[PDB]
Design an enzyme around this catalytic site. Structure first.
Site, PDB file in Angstrom:
ATOM      1  N   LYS A 157      11.036  -1.834 -14.674  1.00  0.00           N
ATOM      2  CA  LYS A 157      10.993  -0.333 -14.737  1.00  0.00           C
ATOM      3  C   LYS A 157       9.645  -0.058 -15.414  1.00  0.00           C
ATOM      4  O   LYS A 157       9.418  -0.367 -16.532  1.00  0.00           O
ATOM      5  CB  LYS A 157      12.189   0.010 -15.406  1.00  0.00           C
TER       6      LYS A 157
ATOM      7  N   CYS B 208       3.841   9.259 -11.851  1.00  0.00           N
ATOM      8  CA  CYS B 208       5.288   9.441 -12.090  1.00  0.00           C
ATOM      9  C   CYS B 208       4.997  11.140 -11.871  1.00  0.00           C
ATOM     10  O   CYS B 208       4.337  11.858 -12.621  1.00  0.00           O
ATOM     11  CB  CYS B 208       5.269   9.258 -13.685  1.00  0.00           C
TER      12      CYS B 208
HETATM   13  C1  LIG Z   1      15.628   5.823  -8.708  1.00  0.00           C
HETATM   14  C2  LIG Z   1      14.237   5.711  -8.743  1.00  0.00           C
HETATM   15  C3  LIG Z   1      13.200   5.391  -9.831  1.00  0.00           C
HETATM   16  C4  LIG Z   1      12.143   4.990  -9.686  1.00  0.00           C
HETATM   17  N1  LIG Z   1      11.277   4.561 -10.849  1.00  0.00           N
HETATM   18  C5  LIG Z   1       9.820   4.203 -10.785  1.00  0.00           C
HETATM   19  C6  LIG Z   1       9.213   3.609 -11.884  1.00  0.00           C
HETATM   20  O1  LIG Z   1       9.793   3.479 -12.909  1.00  0.00           O
HETATM   21  N2  LIG Z   1       7.860   3.699 -11.547  1.00  0.00           N
HETATM   22  C7  LIG Z   1       7.517   3.765 -10.438  1.00  0.00           C
HETATM   23  O2  LIG Z   1       5.906   3.392 -10.371  1.00  0.00           O
HETATM   24  N3  LIG Z   1       7.939   4.097  -9.248  1.00  0.00           N
HETATM   25  C8  LIG Z   1       9.380   4.545  -9.401  1.00  0.00           C
HETATM   26  N4  LIG Z   1       9.922   5.005  -8.332  1.00  0.00           N
HETATM   27  C9  LIG Z   1       9.217   5.190  -7.014  1.00  0.00           C
HETATM   28  C10 LIG Z   1       9.447   3.853  -6.285  1.00  0.00           C
HETATM   29  O3  LIG Z   1       8.915   2.600  -6.912  1.00  0.00           O
HETATM   30  C11 LIG Z   1       8.805   4.061  -4.744  1.00  0.00           C
HETATM   31  O4  LIG Z   1       7.365   4.361  -5.106  1.00  0.00           O
HETATM   32  C12 LIG Z   1       9.500   5.307  -3.903  1.00  0.00           C
HETATM   33  O5  LIG Z   1      10.758   5.362  -4.346  1.00  0.00           O
HETATM   34  C13 LIG Z   1       8.991   5.252  -2.457  1.00  0.00           C
HETATM   35  O6  LIG Z   1       9.561   4.106  -1.973  1.00  0.00           O
HETATM   36  P1  LIG Z   1      10.717   4.076  -1.194  1.00  0.00           P
HETATM   37  O7  LIG Z   1      10.592   5.009  -0.002  1.00  0.00           O
HETATM   38  O8  LIG Z   1      11.141   2.538  -0.799  1.00  0.00           O
HETATM   39  O9  LIG Z   1      11.819   4.655  -2.014  1.00  0.00           O
HETATM   40  C14 LIG Z   1      11.454   5.269  -8.528  1.00  0.00           C
HETATM   41  C15 LIG Z   1      11.851   5.677  -7.521  1.00  0.00           C
HETATM   42  C16 LIG Z   1      13.307   5.987  -7.511  1.00  0.00           C
HETATM   43  C17 LIG Z   1      14.232   5.922  -6.105  1.00  0.00           C
END
Ligand SMILES: Cc1cc2nc3c(=O)[nH]c(=O)nc-3n(C[C@H](O)[C@H](O)[C@H](O)COP(=O)(O)O)c2cc1C
Ligand SMILES: Cc1cc2nc3c(=O)[nH]c(=O)nc-3n(C[C@H](O)[C@H](O)[C@H](O)COP(=O)(O)O)c2cc1C
Lengths: 312, 312
Positions: free
Chosen positions: B44, B131
């Protein structure tokens, strides 16, 4: 119960219209949109001279939406101006004319000639600051100083109320800055959120190939993909531009989607991808579906819920 | 036929890993990801001090994806550093540690302490410059001068190879500028495209309410909504950063989606929303599905098709 409303000193039978670029390039298209049950129509974004646009294939649709890189193919400003001045039946519904010059000078040239027709006929300008498909021409409204310049020069040259087709933003600071720029311009009476989510890339797994030819496959996204983005932008500008109208565009396939746009703040609701795919019959379905949702909820007017999205 | 990769001086059984933030906050989460069939895991995004994050509800999933405004809830850098130093079983798979300081100074503070652990253990830094969910903190990499400052300061303080988690861009000029900034930094060895599509808004039609509490409902979008955007960014940076690796993230639910990411140029493939919804069993399914597609096409290794997307 009916969906009739008044905006910008015009009367509209309902809040629905085509999104610029869809079913609005030729006289045939415009007559078709006029014959439809839509509350209004807007013409294809035009340039001073006719354009062939980008190489085909340049539009492709999929279950979740569409990708395109049309490249402003259009019959030229002279044609759309003639349609507005001579051909459109204003007794049927209001007309918006979209312009998308490739420079501030080109936009200024067009608006100087549009002004007398706006004065005589009441055609409404939608200035496109968000075309994402012409090679080497970045989206104007992603450059806030360029946007200010365009709006200053168009305001001065046109001198009449108009609206602006905005790109989607993804950053709170950008909503803040973009809306503050718009608020500098009292002639900007409506803000259309949003144009395509720019420069996406669809790839076909079987052929291992991009699906459109221009720009190595990179094109604007519309449809189901973009609804939450569109709603965010509608609401962001609704909140920040309390003295302007917001027109919603993006991801509308149903009366429910339109209801969400209106909850977010939309006055008019534009339909792009879904109209391209389903055809102009969609307008009767959208009206029926929106009225059904309103009836179920006990809403009698659009004003009762416009912009009334609840927060937690 | 095999899914093996050898990159960044590490060996990976397959290209799949969690996306930062999903299933990686607690020791329990990290042990779970380690026990899974994934080729790697990332922790995370952390800050110097522990954070509770934004008010709940702050994550909601739907058929087409997810919206969140988590707000960097995390156990604090000390914890993730200790995990990397003492707890992680590197014999199982490589570990990435994500940092997301709220200022350049905070990031510098963390990397100074991470460096000796990276040197000793081989933990790999992913610097989060995207972020979209901390109120009052715009996405760093949407400000190109801020991005350069962060990368200059982190490069100097860290002195070791690292990667950068990038926001999605939507304009060619932005791809051009962003990649050029990254190319100024030889220590940036990988580029993860993409973080969430920022500041979308999901509204529930029945309740007429936004679905998450923070920021009046505005949150990062992931899942099906964002696949073409993610593919565009992966390919854009793959093309513009020929001397770096690109990690794909966004809209991966199937081996076919992973195949598209890899065609676009992805080395590792990260899974966010789909992993949050399905759980870590997803990794065996993704592996089976990717191998199935490779078998059908006669591909024996990932290098045979990585970056080989065809244009028209
Ligand atoms: C619950 C949640 C928490 C996330 N926390 C982070 C994070 O801590 N750091 C980060 O770089 N991206 C974070 N993301 C973004 C994801 O890493 C990812 O870039 C984004 O969800 C797109 O991918 P997906 O379409 O597979 O969900 C988070 C996404 C979600 C859904
Ligand atoms: C075929 C195609 C052509 C378009 N041409 C224009 C255009 O001329 N001017 C403009 O402002 N938007 C144009 N758009 C963008 C749409 O007006 C609309 O903003 C976008 O498609 C998102 O709405 P949707 O989700 O309903 O498709 C075009 C879109 C497509 C699909």
């Amino acid at each position: 119960m009916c969906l009739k409303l008044n905006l910008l000193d015009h009367v509209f039978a309902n809040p629905f219209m085509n999104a610029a670029g869809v079913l609005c390039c030729t006289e045939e298209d415009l007559r078709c949109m006029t014959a439809s049950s839509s509350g209004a129509l807007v013409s294809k974004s035009c340039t001073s001279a006719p354009r062939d646009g980008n190489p085909e294939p340049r539009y492709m649709a999929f279950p979740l939406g569409s990708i395109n890189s049309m490249g402003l193919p259009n019959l030229g400003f002279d044609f759309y101006l003639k349609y507005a001045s001579d051909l459109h039946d204003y007794s049927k519904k209001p007309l918006f004319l979209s312009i998308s010059g490739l420079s501030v000078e080109e936009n200024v040239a067009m608006v100087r000639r549009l002004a007398p027709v706006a004065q005589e006929k009441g055609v409404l300008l939608e200035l496109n600051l968000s075309c994402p498909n012409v090679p080497g021409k970045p989206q104007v409204a992603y450059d806030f100083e360029a946007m200010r310049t365009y709006l200053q020069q168009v305001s001065l040259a046109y001198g009449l109320p108009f609206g602006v087709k905005m790109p989607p933003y993804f950053d709170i600071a950008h909503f803040d800055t973009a809306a503050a720029v718009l608020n500098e311009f009292p002639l900007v009476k409506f803000v259309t959120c949003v144009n395509s989510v720019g420069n996406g890339l669809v790839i076909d797994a079987e052929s291992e190939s991009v699906v459109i030819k221009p720009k190595q496959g990179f094109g604007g996204l519309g449809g189901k993909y973009i609804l939450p983005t569109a709603l965010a932008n509608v609401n962001a500008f609704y909140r920040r531009c309390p003295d302007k109208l917001v027109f919603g565009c993006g991801g509308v396939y149903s009366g429910e989607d339109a209801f969400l746009h209106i909850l977010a703040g939309a006055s008019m609701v534009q339909v792009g991808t879904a109209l391209q795919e389903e055809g102009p019959g969609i307008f009767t379905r959208l009206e029926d579906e929106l009225l059904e949702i309103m009836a179920r909820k006990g809403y009698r007017t659009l004003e009762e819920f416009r912009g009334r999205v609840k927060t937690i």
